[PDB]
Design a protein around this ligand. Structure first.
Ligand code: NAG
Lengths: 125, 39, 50
């Protein structure tokens, strides 16, 4: 069964760095495009970035300065090394597979399978 | 007064129902043609 | 109904306007399988069940 599990969220100080994981099972990244999407408490889903199968990275151009998406194909997992987390970086971070194949209807987000997402909050303690 | 209906004992799996306006010395002659072509 | 005792209603012998369902903002989930939602009004269907 195709299932995406994220881990690594929690409390994080302002101005620090926090690494997130997208340990995937049921499929490999050698032929699929993978995306990271955030979710504010008061706003909708905001697309962070995308990892292609050949290693090509694209990011949100208002968020390029502080995210990094990498793979570990030996462990079939995706990495997200975020730095300098401020107050608006509090989000529930979903990792999802892109649908470049057949789409049964119109999708607002273009994702065929989603993750449960991990929650990150930034405050004093 | 119509008070006797004995045409069936059960009705299990329906696929089509259609309620319509009534079609109807011997005084009336009623001709009907029923055909089953391509369903 | 409850999900274990889910109700099924036959829709038949009528004209169905699916453009008022897909364009409605009331539905949070609208996932169609085997048919496009904008092509629904251009097809005629048999054995429709809700
Ligand atoms: C037909 O009816 C029987 C008995 O009511 C039932 O077991 C069966 O599943 C029905 N088949 C269909 C296609 O509705």
């Amino acid at each position: 069964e195709v299932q995406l599990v994220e881990s690594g969220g929690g409390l994080v100080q302002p101005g620090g760095s926090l690494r997130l994981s997208c340990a995937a099972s049921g499929f490999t990244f050698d032929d699929y495009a993978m995306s990271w999407v955030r979710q504010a408490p008061g706003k909708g889903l905001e697309w962070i970035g995308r990892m292609y199968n050949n290693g090509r990275t694209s990011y949100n151009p208002s968020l390029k300065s502080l995210v990094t998406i990498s793979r570990d194909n030996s462990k079939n997992t995706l990495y997200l090394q975020m730095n300098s987390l401020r107050a608006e970086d509090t989000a529930t971070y979903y990792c999802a597979r892109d649908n470049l194949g057949y789409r049964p209807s119109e999708n607002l987000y273009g994702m065929d399978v989603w993750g449960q997402g991990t929650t990150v909050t930034v405050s004093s303690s | 007064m119509e008070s006797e209906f004995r045409v069936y004992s059960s009705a299990n799996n329906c696929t089509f129902e259609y309620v319509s306006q009534p079609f109807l010395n011997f005084k009336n002659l009623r001709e009907f043609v029923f055909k089953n072509i391509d369903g | 109904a409850s999900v274990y005792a889910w109700n099924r209603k036959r829709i038949s012998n009528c004209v169905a306007d699916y453009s008022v369902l897909y364009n409605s903002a009331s539905f949070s989930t609208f996932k169609c399988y085997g048919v496009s939602p904008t092509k629904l009004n251009d097809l005629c269907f048999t054995n429709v069940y809700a």
